[PDB]
């Protein structure tokens, strides 16, 4: 009699992202067509990055009547667990997050794969002939998440060398022996913090000049805002994937821009996180595939369990319209292919300035074009 | 008065017991027959098996064996498995015992768990050392695809900070013939290259390398795999082709030999049939790691009599009492057992100091021509 | 009306009948149902099996032939054996088909015998051929002790004449099992190697290359034996060392794969041992030239009706009456059979004019790159 | 009742070799004790080099009482069957002339094998630093009765290189050859016709000059005489066994001399040759192993035949009498080894001159020693 729809989240409530306010914002537009079944969304929070404490909670979400399972979008372990379960029990597992180590498959993601992203970089060296390459890894994952950049090129100080930085250890020494080896071009990768923060001692080392070039592999690039870091000169490349083509894009930010005083009023507001922008679209998404699934075969759901072996009898049956969805979100269009990742999507590269960010170029699926 | 210990290993097609398992029943055997350890103290087990790349199942094997009580919890021996019986410990206050490599997260806030398996982190620095002691110029890593570069770190360090050119190559994880791989690596006069795999996948690509034509004194390679020593490298002696590895297994000690010696006297798992090229009466460094898995931690607890095994409730109930302590003697003992000297860092609990021996290809077969430690660097012969 | 033809097959560990006395007797029940030669006439034979590396039965199993009437005699297949037959035949005039190279003194004063197999001291120039062909400055042919070196006297004779500095070298006749000698030949970088040896011998050593790490595109070697297309190269044919050797069977017309194929159909000798690495399926050239040698022979007697097979007697008797004639037409019979074009020299009688098709080991196996003949020099592709 | 053995002999008569008179030599001076048992020597000739022809020859040996079978020495053919049969017969043979392509064994040999022969000419060259080598092959067989030399060396121009001569076709165009490629040694391989006529039209080219250094393989080398070709500068080395020590040298030499030009004077006598000087020795160590055998067993000697499969009872053992022989005949100490050579044994390298032959030096089986 309705349309459920597990959520783990693990974002926070106080100047968080705003996901648990993403989905909300999704439930009413869906629920705004009047004329069918409802749309409810059951929102599952999380505590700490754990398999253990994940395992608990899927065993409260199949006893429920649920069609699909959204997120974690920042719970690298706790997405894993999710999906080798999700698999055992036929119903989708809506990704969107973390990616790391890719036997029963059955989900789909609307975060750009590691193959993407790693092409991605690949394709912007490229109009550079290939220059001094000197990655700033953050941790470990850092090699996976760009497993096909790192492999693509030869390992060494002429071409592409890779450097970790130590936790509490922060980015200095770094900076500094990229000057030794006159290294011009630096792609760093981390969240938005240790994004803001590579740059901010290296702006203070000339490492600002025109003559470097940077490339940002983290997606929270449109909100990372640089105020007294940056210059006239500066080359400090970005990723972004929000959609303007969408009328509802304005709306959306609007929630989050009152919503973030309106609770925590201890900061400023970024601007629009790509978190809540993924949750947002994957709402629509299933409810879209459900309901092409529900032109063909009724659908019923279930009470499952952790302790019976049984399974979604329309799993399989939904999955593949989970294939054949074709949705205009913020953040482009929606489709899956294959294995199920998503394709025929545009990445737009943005870059800072003195006020603001200006789309300097655009990476498709098949082929690279700036300018 | 007795106490209970875990146990958790998967099925294999091979019997009813793996050599993993097999390692496990082996140990608790002798130190019970042995007043040399645990005197007036007899040891006990409850063997839960479960399934292959199954980390779900796994989680409810795991918390089932907290019910019936017990000190320790053994397994199993897969990646995303253990991954999961590791978090349900470090929840419940519980040791983990692990024998084996596995993909730990650097945001794992965990602290109830030790690995004897010698820390990739700190193998690699071993396998550097033979790089540039070959004064070598170039270098071509080929990791398996079962697992990612992030076990190579330290690698793909090097050519930042010391002088090495190195490239990376992905073995095809789906079949051991890789024509292609090897035919490139010919192409590129890349000599150099050094195998990241078990001994498994190893020899499925000696066999490839041979019929390339690319065994010759012109190439050499070299191997992360513990279990070089265990290889049937015949057909390959008489070539000419270099081969460099390392053995943590100390079978220059007579206590050490006298061990294995009685486990081959028990085999169970029949031996593999030639087709792989693995040289049959050797025992592994999987189930040797087991051995050691069990004193490492029958000292520890040798020196805490005052412990109950209380029956706990994973997804609900409080951390085990004497577990916040249990654990801290654990990644405090040392034994001399089968694979050296055992010791726990004082931090991350990781074993990152060990004992290996350098291990060549040499007309006769594979000699050990010297050692490596953390703490010295390097002493060749 | 009928004819008595001869018949001497050593005995063999492989059955009844060796391929060697099968070719015999499928050649003589070929023509009989065959219209296109021996039209009016009917063929029948004596058979007379002896042992191995045994003359002297051999001489008094021919001479027990000829009491039994007959216009020729094929066989043995052995050296020192079908020499003894060769001169109790020149010496009652009666023809000696051999189908198998033999050390053959210079001092022959013989004259009623004809050999098929292609005449070693032309086959010699189209090795030297290919020496030059490959701008070839330094080889090392490496010979049996079975026969002398003097089977390769052209080859000896290439330094003088020709800019080549050859060397000599022998395989150990007792076990094919010879490290050493491939030993030295990697010590001197003899990459160029010219071996002379059946597909027995000559599959023993290659397996000893491989193990020598000397199987690589550096090394080419050169092999005289006509059997090198049944030779299972497919261990080495990834590899990429090159492989060059010769073919007198005409495999390209299909009159001529027609025998070969009704040929497998019948073994009777079980295929031998994957051990020694010989390719089933095809026919061996042993056996090619005695189906040829009873066709170049039913040829000649065609055209001389007038002939009875008289009963001589050797030790003490008179020359065959029509022997010195009936010997005549078989050195000026021509016939297109298996190993091609068949014809006896105007001279010697020995087969020193044929036609053969050189072969290369390429990335799929071996591949005809073109032929040779002594009228014409060496046409390539 | 008495000692017989046959010898298969292919020497003429008129203005031979004199072999059948060698053997009468022989035996003549065995009966001069007085005191045994006799000694009978059958002679049995052959016509032309056949297989054949030597067959039926042994089963006329076999009916008669032999203990041992000599010759033939210039039969290489008929001397190879001859073993054959002796070796199924148990009747030892002694072998003393050709020697090609060495299952059954039972016999040995007088006459050099091809391996000290080889080594004789390698061990010349020696005290020369090996100049350029240039073989003078005869015919197909001089490559394996030096098969030790040819492949002891490199082959090629500045080391050794192998020139055959065709039949009918004469020393010519070869040593025309030899004078391009500057080379300086020869040595030809042919018997006592050959090896006068090689450097008769050699000598009128300047190739009788000290500058150039001939070795000959011939064992007909002392009764070799080259008048009208040589010089007091030249250089032709040789070989001989003739051991002067023998007191009884001096009257053999008488027979043969006088013999010649007693039943054919149409020339004149070179001088003793090799080939009546091992059967001279061979006849003696024949009854020399018997007389030692004739101690330990009594031997009886019963008629064979080639029909039947019977063999010599005391074959086997007379076999291990002639190996422990120690006969000092016409050419040495002949003694033997363990497969049945010759060794111990010293070999006298003569060399031509005005008048003559001159002992430059000698070549043991161990070792050389020129001048």
Known sequence: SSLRMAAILDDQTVCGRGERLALALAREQINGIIEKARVEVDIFELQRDSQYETTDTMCQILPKGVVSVLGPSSSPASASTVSHICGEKEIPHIKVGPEETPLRFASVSLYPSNEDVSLAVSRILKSFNYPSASLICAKAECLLRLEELVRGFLISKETLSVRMLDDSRDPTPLLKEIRDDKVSTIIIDANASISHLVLRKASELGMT?????????????????????????????????????????????????????????????????????????????????????????????????????????????????????????????????????????????????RQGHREIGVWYSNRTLAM | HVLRFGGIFEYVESGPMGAEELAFRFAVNTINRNRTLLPNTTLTYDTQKINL???????????????????????????????????????????????????????????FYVSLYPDFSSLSRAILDLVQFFKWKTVTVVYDDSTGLIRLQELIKAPSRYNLRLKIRQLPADTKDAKPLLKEMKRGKEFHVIFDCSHEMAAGILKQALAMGMMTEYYHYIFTTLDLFALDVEPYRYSGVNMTGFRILNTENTQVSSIIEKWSMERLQAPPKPDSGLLDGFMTTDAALMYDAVHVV?????????????????????????????????????????????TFNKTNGLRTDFDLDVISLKEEGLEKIGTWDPASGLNMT
Chains 1, 4 share one sequence.
């Open chain 1, 209 to 353: 000049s025109a003559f470097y070039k940077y490339i940002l592999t983290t997606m929270d690039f449109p909100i990372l805002h640089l105020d007294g870091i940056v210059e006239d000169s500066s080359n400090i490349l970005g990723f972004s994937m929000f959609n303007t083509s969408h009328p509802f894009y304005p709306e959306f930010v609007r929630s989050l821009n009152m919503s973030w005083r309106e609770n925590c009023e201890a900061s400023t507001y970024p601007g629009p996180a790509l978190s809540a922008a993924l949750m947002f679209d994957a709402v629509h998404v299933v409810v879209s595939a459900v309901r092409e699934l529900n032109r063909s075969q009724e659908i019923g759901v279930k009470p499952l369990a952790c302790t019976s072996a049984n399974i979604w009898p329309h799993g399989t049956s939904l999955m593949n319209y989970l294939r054949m969805v074709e949705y205009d979100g913020l953040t482009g269009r929606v489709e899956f292919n294959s294995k199920g990742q998503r394709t025929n999507y545009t990445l737009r590269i943005l870059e800072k300035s």
């Open chain 2, 53 to 111: 790349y199954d980390s779900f199942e796994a989680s409810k094997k795991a918390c089932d064996q907290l019910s019936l009580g017990v000190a320790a919890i053994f397994g199993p021996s897969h990646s995303s498995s253990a991954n999961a019986v590791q978090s349900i410990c470090n929840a419940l206050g519980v040791p983990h015992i692990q024998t084996r490599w596995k993909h730990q997260v650097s945001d794992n806030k965990d602290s």
């Open chain 2, 298 to 342: 029958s000292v520890a607890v040798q020196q805490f009599p005052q412990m109950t095994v209380s029956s706990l409730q994973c997804n609900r109930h409080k951390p085990w009492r004497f577990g916040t302590r249990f654990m801290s003697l654990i990644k405090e003992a040392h034994w001399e057992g089968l694979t050296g000297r055992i």
